[PDB]
Amino acid sequence: PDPAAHLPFFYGSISRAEAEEHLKLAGMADGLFLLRQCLRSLGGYVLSLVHDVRFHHFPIERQLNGTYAIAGGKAHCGPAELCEFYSRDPDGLPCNLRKPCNRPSGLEPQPGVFDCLRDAMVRDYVRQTWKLEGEALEQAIISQAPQVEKLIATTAHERMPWYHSSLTREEAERKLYSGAQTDGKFLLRPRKEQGTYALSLIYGKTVYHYLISQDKAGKYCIPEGTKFDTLWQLVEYLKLKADGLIYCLKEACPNMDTSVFESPFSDPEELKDKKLFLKRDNLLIADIELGCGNFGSVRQGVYRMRKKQIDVAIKVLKQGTEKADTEEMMREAQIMHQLDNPYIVRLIGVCQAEALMLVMEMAGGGPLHKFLVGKREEIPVSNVAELLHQVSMGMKYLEEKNFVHRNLAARNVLLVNRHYAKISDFGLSKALGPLKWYAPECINFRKFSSRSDVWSYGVTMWEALSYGQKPYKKMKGPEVMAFIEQGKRMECPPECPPELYALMSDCWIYKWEDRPDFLTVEQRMRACYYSLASKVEGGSALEVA
Numbered sequence: 001p002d003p004a005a006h007l008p009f010f011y012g013s014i015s016r017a018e019a020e021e022h023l024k025l026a027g028m029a030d031g032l033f034l035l036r037q038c039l040r041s042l043g044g045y046v047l048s049l050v051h052d053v054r055f056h057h058f059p060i061e062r063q064l065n066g067t068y069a070i071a072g073g074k075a076h077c078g079p080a081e082l083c084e085f086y087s088r089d090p091d092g093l094p095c096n097l098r099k100p101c102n103r104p105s106g107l108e109p110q111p112g113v114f115d116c117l118r119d120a121m122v123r124d125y126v127r128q129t130w131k132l133e134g135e136a137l138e139q140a141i142i143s144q145a146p147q148v149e150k151l152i153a154t155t156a157h158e159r160m161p162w163y164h165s166s167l168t169r170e171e172a173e174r175k176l177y178s179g180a181q182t183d184g185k186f187l188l189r190p191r192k193e194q195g196t197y198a199l200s201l202i203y204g205k206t207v208y209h210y211l212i213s214q215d216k217a218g219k220y221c222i223p224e225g226t227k228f229d230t231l232w233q234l235v236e237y238l239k240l241k242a243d244g245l246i247y248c249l250k251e252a253c254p255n256m257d258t259s260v261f262e263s264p265f266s267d268p269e270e271l272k273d274k275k276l277f278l279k280r281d282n283l284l285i286a287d288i289e290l291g292c293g294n295f296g297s298v299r300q301g302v303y304r305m306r307k308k309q310i311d312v313a314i315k316v317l318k319q320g321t322e323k324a325d326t327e328e329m330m331r332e333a334q335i336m337h338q339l340d341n342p343y344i345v346r347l348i349g350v351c352q353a354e355a356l357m358l359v360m361e362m363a364g365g366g367p368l369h370k371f372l373v374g375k376r377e378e379i380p381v382s383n384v385a386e387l388l389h390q391v392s393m394g395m396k397y398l399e400e401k402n403f404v405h406r407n408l409a410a411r412n413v414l415l416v417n418r419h420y421a422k423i424s425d426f427g428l429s430k431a432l433g434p435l436k437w438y439a440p441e442c443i444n445f446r447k448f449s450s451r452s453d454v455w456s457y458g459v460t461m462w463e464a465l466s467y468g469q470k471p472y473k474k475m476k477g478p479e480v481m482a483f484i485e486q487g488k489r490m491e492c493p494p495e496c497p498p499e500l501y502a503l504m505s506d507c508w509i510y511k512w513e514d515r516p517d518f519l520t521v522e523q524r525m526r527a528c529y530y531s532l533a534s535k536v537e538g539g540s541a542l543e544v545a
């Protein structure tokens with residue numbers, strides 16, 4: 001949601017009185033402070049502190065460049081950085097921010113109109129921009145909301161269908177009277193004054209005009225007072241709440257960073273009749289490897305379908321069976337054939353010809369650990385957090401599908417691109433028979449469960465957060481087993497935020513029953529991730545180009 005949602009002292013959209021109340025009840029001490037959302041400005045806040053037993057409310061606007069600042073004060077990249085700053089320097093206020101009035105018990109910020117407005121746009125943005133639906137849309141959103149908002153805040157209004165770049169009041173008027181004179185028909189036209197446009201809309205068969213003024217901060221204003229960062233937000237806002245408007249806005253009067261939804265993010269089946277076994281004649285295989293591992297080798301190739309030719313990855317040699325146990329293998333495959341989720345390497349089908357081949361979705365970016373080695377200066381942490389979050393989305397999926405992985409590890413997290421990771425080889429592990437990814441009970445009692453995987457995710461997090469470093473480097477066999485029992489876990493990676501190491505730690509509880517399940521893991525990894533996805537950027541083609 002809000003880039004202040006993680007802040008333990010942020011209360012969301014509470015009133016000025018509610019605010020004072022929480023402070024009153026906290027000790028009215030000098031330095032007591034809380035943060036909240038400005039009911040009148042989109043993306044803005046209000047710093048509320050106590051000094052000499054009296055309340056002080058400072059509004060915090062969001063400049064057109066993304067920083068936050070109290071009028072006359074310094075600019076800050078975010079609520080977090082702002083509060084961290086004034087805590088060590090009054091720089092204008094009655095006194096430094098000292099004891100924070102953290103939210104009581106288990107209360108969360110009070111979601112308001114801007115939070116609701118924000119989701120709606122993102123939602124209708126992906127649905128719109130990539131015609132996605134169902135969980136697929138839900139999966140796109142949950143993971144890319146951070147990136148989608150940025151897009152929404154940079155999309156030019158000149159783009160929107162309701163904007164008319166060269167219209168006069170008289171014309172717009174006759175353009176609105178020219179057709180379906182329905183309540184809510186509207187358009188926007190820029191007025192002469194720099195940063196001024198007019199909202200022209202129909203109500204009761206009559207056209208109404210509303211000046212839209214732009215202030216010094218650039219924020220767009222409605223006669224009523226509410227401010228927005230762009231017209232589009234203002235428009236969607238008036239679409240729900242119609243303050244100052246004679247009627248809610250309705251129908252319109254018409255006239256770099258690779259995201260995850262390009263290429264097969266969605267299942268290959270978008271009109272089916274898919275069988276488990278494929279025809280070797282529909283499969284084109286190369287004799288050139290993409291690497292190999294414990295099981296067979298991986299070769300690239302293409303697969304032709306009734307209407308499409310897709311690119312695949314063939315893991316030649318699954319292993320092959322010697323007895324009527326080729327049925328058991330086929331049992332698993334049957335199940336895997338069902339698993340469908342963007343963050344997982346889907347199984348297209350199996351084919352038995354010169355060998356027992358496993359055909360999967362193409363994920364050519366390579367393993368997560370190879371992609372991160374030596375790139376600590378290239379790939380920002382927020383970017384790694386994003387991948388670890390995608391990794392838990394597939395894991396939470398696989399867990400609710402009662403399908404244990406058994407081999408979660410970096411080597412098994414495959415990248416489609418910089419911001420798209422897929423989990424692979426989920427199942428082939430249990431086909432036959434450096435492996436410090438297993439939980440203690442996997443080695444101690446042959447026990448495998450989603451809880452067992454949550455441990456491997458813990459290890460994977462480490463592998464990634466420490467940019468491709470081998471787990472428990474100075475060890476191998478039992479040395480680890482021992483190391484574990486003695487209550488020792490791996491150290492917190494350099495430049496790895498506390499919340500992650502905290503999550504990672506909970507992932508390494510010896511009693512699997514105490515370890516979080518992926519549902520909880522995924523919630524936590526998201527909150528962490530979202531908050532990290534604010535601090536601008538670092539390295540490569542990020543001129544926001």
Ligand SMILES: Nc1ncnc2c1ncn2[C@@H]1O[C@H](COP(=O)(O)OP(=O)(O)NP(=O)(O)O)[C@@H](O)[C@H]1O
Nearest residue numbers: 291292293294295298313361362363364366411425
């Ligand atoms: N679906 C795929 N698309 C593209 N490359 C793949 C795919 N699956 C595997 N690879 C490549 O093969 C390598 C991984 O080898 P693989 O045979 O999958 O096992 P591994 O991760 O080395 N170990 P393990 O699964 O534990 O036996 C990676 O470096 C990938 O580049």
Ligand SMILES: [Mg+2]
Nearest residue numbers: 293411412425
């Ligand atoms: Mg693998």
